[PDB]
Write a protein that holds these residues in place. Structure first.
Motif, mmCIF file in Angstrom:
data_model
loop_
_atom_site.group_PDB
_atom_site.id
_atom_site.type_symbol
_atom_site.label_atom_id
_atom_site.label_comp_id
_atom_site.label_asym_id
_atom_site.label_seq_id
_atom_site.Cartn_x
_atom_site.Cartn_y
_atom_site.Cartn_z
ATOM 1 N N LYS A 159 0.456 -1.547 -0.254
ATOM 2 C CA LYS A 159 -0.098 0.266 0.192
ATOM 3 C C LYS A 159 0.920 1.188 -0.554
ATOM 4 O O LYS A 159 0.524 2.107 -1.168
ATOM 5 C CB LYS A 159 -0.738 0.139 1.327
ATOM 6 N N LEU A 160 1.860 1.198 0.670
ATOM 7 C CA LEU A 160 3.511 2.451 0.889
ATOM 8 C C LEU A 160 3.484 2.944 -0.293
ATOM 9 O O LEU A 160 3.556 4.022 -1.470
ATOM 10 C CB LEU A 160 4.139 2.262 1.646
ATOM 11 N N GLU A 161 3.675 1.603 -1.360
ATOM 12 C CA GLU A 161 4.423 2.044 -2.915
ATOM 13 C C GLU A 161 3.373 2.425 -3.573
ATOM 14 O O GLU A 161 3.538 3.020 -4.322
ATOM 15 C CB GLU A 161 4.873 0.514 -3.311
ATOM 16 N N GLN A 162 2.354 2.530 -3.842
ATOM 17 C CA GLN A 162 1.242 2.147 -4.269
ATOM 18 C C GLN A 162 0.656 3.464 -4.350
ATOM 19 O O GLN A 162 0.390 4.335 -4.556
ATOM 20 C CB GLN A 162 0.015 1.709 -4.460
ATOM 21 N N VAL A 163 0.533 4.078 -2.949
ATOM 22 C CA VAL A 163 0.309 5.714 -2.497
ATOM 23 C C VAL A 163 1.292 7.127 -2.699
ATOM 24 O O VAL A 163 1.043 7.863 -3.642
ATOM 25 C CB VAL A 163 -0.080 5.606 -1.215
ATOM 26 N N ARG A 164 2.520 5.670 -2.469
ATOM 27 C CA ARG A 164 4.201 6.515 -3.200
ATOM 28 C C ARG A 164 3.425 7.292 -4.906
ATOM 29 O O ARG A 164 4.198 7.937 -5.109
ATOM 30 C CB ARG A 164 4.929 6.680 -2.890
ATOM 31 N N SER A 165 3.414 6.723 -5.287
ATOM 32 C CA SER A 165 3.188 6.216 -6.863
ATOM 33 C C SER A 165 2.164 7.309 -7.102
ATOM 34 O O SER A 165 1.847 8.239 -7.603
ATOM 35 C CB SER A 165 2.566 4.908 -7.472
ATOM 36 N N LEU A 166 1.082 7.362 -7.038
ATOM 37 C CA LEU A 166 -0.090 7.691 -7.212
ATOM 38 C C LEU A 166 -0.176 10.153 -6.873
ATOM 39 O O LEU A 166 0.363 10.305 -7.302
ATOM 40 C CB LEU A 166 -1.311 7.623 -6.442
ATOM 41 N N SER A 167 0.643 9.829 -5.223
ATOM 42 C CA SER A 167 1.323 11.067 -4.836
ATOM 43 C C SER A 167 2.545 11.591 -5.570
ATOM 44 O O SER A 167 1.742 12.948 -6.016
ATOM 45 C CB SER A 167 1.569 11.569 -3.237
ATOM 46 N N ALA A 168 2.902 11.278 -6.210
ATOM 47 C CA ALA A 168 4.334 12.022 -7.286
ATOM 48 C C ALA A 168 3.696 12.046 -8.781
ATOM 49 O O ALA A 168 4.220 12.807 -8.872
ATOM 50 C CB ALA A 168 5.413 10.797 -7.370
ATOM 51 N N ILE A 169 3.039 11.188 -9.680
ATOM 52 C CA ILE A 169 2.757 11.559 -10.403
ATOM 53 C C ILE A 169 0.777 12.662 -10.141
ATOM 54 O O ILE A 169 1.087 12.962 -11.377
ATOM 55 C CB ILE A 169 1.516 9.762 -11.185
ATOM 56 N N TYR A 170 0.818 12.107 -8.992
ATOM 57 C CA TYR A 170 -0.705 13.699 -9.440
ATOM 58 C C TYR A 170 0.417 14.027 -8.880
ATOM 59 O O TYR A 170 -0.646 16.052 -9.427
ATOM 60 C CB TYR A 170 -1.391 13.150 -8.493
ATOM 61 N N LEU A 171 1.060 14.677 -8.572
ATOM 62 C CA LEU A 171 1.834 16.166 -8.369
ATOM 63 C C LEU A 171 2.226 16.372 -9.782
ATOM 64 O O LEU A 171 2.356 17.582 -10.356
ATOM 65 C CB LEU A 171 3.057 15.874 -6.775
ATOM 66 N N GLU A 172 3.047 15.622 -9.796
ATOM 67 C CA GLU A 172 3.726 15.385 -11.794
ATOM 68 C C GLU A 172 2.324 16.486 -12.466
ATOM 69 O O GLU A 172 2.709 17.241 -13.724
ATOM 70 C CB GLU A 172 3.865 14.397 -12.049
ATOM 71 N N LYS A 173 1.466 16.415 -11.946
ATOM 72 C CA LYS A 173 0.394 16.447 -13.363
ATOM 73 C C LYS A 173 -0.181 17.714 -13.189
ATOM 74 O O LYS A 173 -0.697 18.148 -14.447
ATOM 75 C CB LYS A 173 -1.316 15.293 -13.068
ATOM 76 N N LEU A 174 -0.582 17.750 -11.718
ATOM 77 C CA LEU A 174 -0.457 19.501 -11.453
ATOM 78 C C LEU A 174 0.070 20.344 -11.724
ATOM 79 O O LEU A 174 -0.641 21.155 -12.627
ATOM 80 C CB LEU A 174 -0.649 19.574 -10.003
ATOM 81 N N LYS A 175 1.690 19.763 -11.965
ATOM 82 C CA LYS A 175 2.562 20.644 -12.130
ATOM 83 C C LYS A 175 2.608 21.092 -13.733
ATOM 84 O O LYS A 175 2.634 21.925 -14.204
ATOM 85 C CB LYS A 175 4.057 20.010 -11.974
ATOM 86 N N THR A 176 2.252 20.154 -14.830
ATOM 87 C CA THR A 176 2.646 19.713 -15.842
ATOM 88 C C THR A 176 1.279 21.032 -16.219
ATOM 89 O O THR A 176 1.331 21.490 -17.146
ATOM 90 C CB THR A 176 2.428 18.878 -16.767
ATOM 91 N N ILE A 177 0.209 20.798 -15.822
ATOM 92 C CA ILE A 177 -0.922 21.646 -16.046
ATOM 93 C C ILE A 177 -1.378 23.213 -15.454
ATOM 94 O O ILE A 177 -1.147 23.865 -16.234
ATOM 95 C CB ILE A 177 -2.373 21.080 -15.744
ATOM 96 N N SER A 178 0.148 23.427 -14.949
ATOM 97 C CA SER A 178 -0.185 24.633 -14.392
ATOM 98 C C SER A 178 0.666 25.440 -15.762
ATOM 99 O O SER A 178 0.559 26.466 -15.156
ATOM 100 C CB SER A 178 0.855 25.443 -13.272
ATOM 101 N N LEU A 179 1.778 24.672 -16.183
ATOM 102 C CA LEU A 179 2.286 25.407 -16.876
ATOM 103 C C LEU A 179 1.176 26.014 -18.076
ATOM 104 O O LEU A 179 1.513 26.601 -19.093
ATOM 105 C CB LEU A 179 3.682 24.498 -17.544
#
Length: 346
Positions: A91-111
């Motif tokens: 579960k830790l690895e899954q939530v780590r993956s999701l947190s990082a990719i979603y943060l990535e999504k927000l940043k790319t959208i921000s640009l």
């Protein structure tokens, strides 16, 4: 004692991770509202804080994993301890993956948000200069000024190509991240569609600016030539009528010997007037072409201004000139013609 304590602590931290997971999923499912720039920044900050919360839980998991392994090396409880450990690690690895990719999504959208908002202001500037220039050029020097303003505009727009090229790359980037999120976490991209339409629409508007500048420049190159052709024919004719009218008024107003000269000068002048009948029709021909060009350029501008959403009429002034020339020439022919008759019967 330490086995039972570690299982309990492993279950609790897995629940905490699952709660972080559910909060992140509900966040990434939520499209931006009426303040996209501000909201995305707020959500990036929140997701940075959420990512640090998950990482804090990751330190708890690492501690609990070391303690478990110490106990397991010493037990009917061991299959439960191993299983619970593997569930928490998974579960830790899954939530780590999701947190990082979603943060990535927000940043790319921000640009993309920033990029489209910048392109809007660039589009607004160019579209307004095109809207603004309502008046048509009346003279050769006014023509060259209009061309210069469009030449500048053309130069500015060409330099903005990197801005729009970057926007296409920024949107592409956001699409790729959303696809990986879709493929790795099963959540559709709820945001990207809003901005593909936004980006696509700005691109079309920019093309219309580029296209309309090229059309408008070209209008004036043809319109300018038509002005030169008309003025080269109307100026010598208009000067000639003024010259001839004063000669006829002088010859007309001015014994048997004298009468022969009066008829002679009037009869000769009427011949001169007739010879200019071609030069008038030539001037009328050129003027019609110039008026048509002034009409074509005018409608070009009113069309573009309406799609995005007078003072006087440009060709109306040109209309008045032809009126004066044709009127004076028909008047001149008649006045000389009647005066020859008045001498003829006398």
């Amino acid at each position: 004692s330490r086995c039972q304590r570690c299982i309990s602590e492993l279950k609790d931290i897995r629940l905490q991770l699952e709660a972080c997971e559910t909060r992140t999923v509900h966040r990434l499912r939520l499209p931006l509202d009426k303040e996209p720039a501000r909201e995305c920044a707020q959500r990036i900050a929140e997701q940075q804080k959420a990512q640090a919360e998950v990482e804090g839980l990751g330190k708890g998991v690492a501690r609990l994993s070391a303690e478990a392994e110490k106990v397991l090396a010493l037990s009917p409880a061991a299959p439960t301890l191993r299983s619970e450990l593997e569930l928490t690690l998974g579960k830790l690895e899954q939530v780590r993956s999701l947190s990082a990719i979603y943060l990535e999504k927000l940043k790319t959208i921000s640009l993309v948000i920033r990029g489209t908002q910048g392109a809007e202001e660039v589009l607004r500037a160019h579209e307004e200069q095109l809207k603004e220039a309502q008046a048509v050029p009346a003279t050769l020097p006014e023509l060259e000024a209009t061309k210069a303003s469009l030449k500048k505009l053309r130069a500015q727009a060409e330099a903005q190509q990197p801005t729009f090229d970057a926007l296409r790359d920024e949107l592409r980037g956001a699409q790729e991240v959303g696809e990986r999120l879709q493929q790795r976490h099963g959540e559709r991209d709820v945001e990207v569609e809003r901005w593909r339409e936004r980006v696509a629409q700005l691109l079309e508007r920019w093309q219309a600016v580029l296209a309309q500048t090229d059309v408008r420049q070209r209008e004036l190159e043809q319109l300018g030539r038509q002005l030169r052709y008309y003025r080269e024919s109307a100026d010598p004719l208009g000067a000639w009528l003024q010259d001839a009218r004063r000669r006829q008024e002088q010859i007309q107003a001015m014994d048997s010997q004298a009468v022969r000269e009066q008829l002679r000068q009037e009869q000769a002048l009427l011949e001169e007037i007739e010879r200019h009948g071609e030069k008038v029709e030539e001037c009328q021909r050129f003027a019609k072409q110039y008026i048509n060009a002034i009409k074509d350029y005018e409608l070009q501008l009113v069309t573009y201004k309406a799609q995005l959403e007078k003072v006087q009429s440009g060709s109306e002034s040109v209309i008045q000139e032809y009126v004066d020339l044709r009127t004076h020439y028909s008047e001149l022919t008649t006045l000389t013609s009647q005066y020859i008759k008045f001498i003829s019967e006398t």
